[PDB]
Amino acid sequence: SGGYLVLYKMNYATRIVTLEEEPIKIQHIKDPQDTITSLILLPPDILDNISTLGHLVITTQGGYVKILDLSNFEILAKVEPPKKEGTEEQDTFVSVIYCSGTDRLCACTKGGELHFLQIGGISGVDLLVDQPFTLEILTSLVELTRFETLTPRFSATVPPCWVETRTWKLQTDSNSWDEHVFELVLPKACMVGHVDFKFVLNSNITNIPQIQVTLLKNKAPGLLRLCPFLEDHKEDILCGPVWLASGLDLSGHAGMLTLTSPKLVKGMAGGKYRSFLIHVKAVNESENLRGCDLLQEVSVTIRRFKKTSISKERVQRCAMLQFSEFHEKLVNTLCRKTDDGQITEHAQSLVLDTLCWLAGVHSNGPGSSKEGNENLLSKTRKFLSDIVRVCFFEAGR
Amino acid sequence: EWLVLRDGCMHCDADGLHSLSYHPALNAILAVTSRGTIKVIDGTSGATLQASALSAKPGGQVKCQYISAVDKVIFVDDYAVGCRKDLNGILLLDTALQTPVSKQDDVVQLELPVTEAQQLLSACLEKVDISSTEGYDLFITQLKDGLKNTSHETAANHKVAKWATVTFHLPHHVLKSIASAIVNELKKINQNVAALPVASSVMDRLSYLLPSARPELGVGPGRSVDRSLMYSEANRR
Amino acid sequence: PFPCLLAGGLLTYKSPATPLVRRTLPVLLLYSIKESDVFPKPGTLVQCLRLPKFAEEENLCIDSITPCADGIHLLVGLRTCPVE
């Protein structure tokens, strides 16, 4: 026989971890050439991109790779071993592991080769614009506006010149003083809210350095002009390019940057992107540290959008971005010209919350078509006197 | 029928592969050859990061396994079982299965990173004068040759540079005296350089490698503790 | 719920033929691990699970033991034990 697969039952009857004598499942490998040498269990959630017990990948004696449902041990996927180069001999697979970086099954052959096996291969939505400005829907919009802190920790590596919700202190290294790439990987694929970038500079700084930081979409592996490194990855930019002056404190020794963009949410709407790149360059027109070397300390933290009770929030969040006529109705609500009752201070407050939301998200638009921005700013300036009157004269604090 | 897609192959070793291990923390394929050498391969480009012989006995049957719950790699040879975890992003697998020595004169293989070696060389050539220490010239020669060999691989690839290590096959007592001398010399000159934690870590590691060099922990009222040996965090806890 | 060590062992014993014949049988041995603070002592057997008859008739040996991701099921892979 090629071996046996016995599915037993965990016993929690007493206070001591015991086992049950009766096996739930008995499986026989009729083929002698299919003798089991190594096995790996695949979590079922990978395929989500009697309750199912996941799938098992086993290497046979003859090199065949078998993927079987653990519930019934039925041969669902079969992969024959490859041919050794220059001959017809079987390059029999010996042991199999799972490579999460490539999302593949990495198996070793008899001849020392390594092979990878890959598994797997707007209309009709209810928008958040057409409905009127009732209190409940505005409350739902505000609940969609909220943010949540990412927990647990994440994975990110930095150039060695920096030494460690995380922080890193910078050492005076000029090996890569020009370019600095910080690579980050999301722990799980979920709704990306924004990222907070905190820095501390040198205490003896009298003039502000001309240094820029730009978020970038990390590229998936194959299966006034910006710096050449940013130009190489220009087509996949997702924030900025913003300079250092956008967030300096009064002292000049600290600062702040919130990195996000409408293009960011519009591109995560496909639900594929999971890793990002932070690109840092000093742009030019005692320790004479220039630009990147001038930074003293850096701290990074990443937030997420709050997961509400309304599903398919991707299209809802992309609605207002794609359809800008909503803002015009909102400025009408601001003017109190609309006849659908009198607008209360709570509804106006939520309207202003939505307006601050859209201004904040659109504050960093990388090469985006400003036609929507032009339309909302035109609707602003068209009713600017009325809105400032109703807010600063006919409204509370 | 479940669908499986094939997209090519890469060549790991010419002697054949028997057992495998993947390290999720480093995206490193710790492929185990049938001759006992472990080839660490980067999981993002398909390039071998390093090759290690684990300092194990020749001809032994090694078996490498990875545990993601504890994030530790277990190597089981025919004689002894070792446990390893990543340090500064690299797995120090050169002495993964090294058997503990019984005497101070027994030669111990010592692995160090590139940056630690550079700091040690800079201190010993500019800021530390330990020429009176035993084995100092041999250690200096080994450090210089390792650094000049490692710099060539450092200038080419960064990941290969980080995975590259410097190996000193030196007696245990010689290494203890050199490390203690570096620590004392850096303490008397009151210079806070990166060579001091490296020397302290090296001396503590060598002490841990020798069961005969373990005075009892005297935790009791009215009794002082010898701070020089107590520098290890394990003693403090 | 004290931790337990489950070792897959193969027993070889001399039995009369129905000259002594060497018989091989694989069993699961479950031992206590956590020391006492009538709980079984560490190194003393807690449970001796017996594999079914097809393991002994074909002289199989326990190849691999792998708990399932559910936490309620256990998978045991068996293979033909070579004869000395």
UniProtKB/Swiss-Prot annotation, chain B:
WD repeats lie at residues 15-53, 54-83. Expressed in brain cancer cells. Ubiquitinated; mediated by RNF41 E3 ligase and leads to proteasomal degradation, impairing inhibition of apoptosis. Deubiquitinated by USP8/UBPY. Autoubiquitinated; mediated by E1 ubiquitin activating enzyme UBA6. Proteolytically cleaved. Acts as substrate for CASP3, CASP6, CASP7, CASP9 and HTRA2. Homodimer; antiparallel. Interacts with RNF41. Interacts with DIABLO/SMAC, likely with higher affinity to SMAC dimer than SMAC monomer; this interaction blocks the substrate-binding site and inhibits the caspase inhibition activity of BIRC6. Interacts with KIF23/MKLP1, USP8/UBPY, BIRC5/survivin, MAP2K1/MEK1, RAB8A/RAB8, RAB11A/RAB11, PLK1, EXOC3/SEC6 and EXOC4/SEC8. The BIR domain is essential for its anti-apoptotic function and is important for binding to DIABLO/SMAC and caspases. Anti-apoptotic protein known as inhibitor of apoptosis (IAP) which can regulate cell death by controlling caspases and by acting as an E3 ubiquitin-protein ligase. Unlike most IAPs, does not contain a RING domain and it is not a RING-type E3 ligase. Instead acts as a dual E2/E3 enzyme that combines ubiquitin conjugating (E2) and ubiquitin ligase (E3) activities in a single polypeptide. Ubiquitination is mediated by a non-canonical E1 ubiquitin activating enzyme UBA6. Belongs to the BIRC6 family. This is Dual E2 ubiquitin-conjugating enzyme/E3 ubiquitin-protein ligase BIRC6. It comes from Homo sapiens. The lineage of its organism: Eukaryota, Metazoa, Chordata, Craniata, Vertebrata. The gene is BIRC6. The chain holds residues 54 to 290 of 4857 of the full protein.
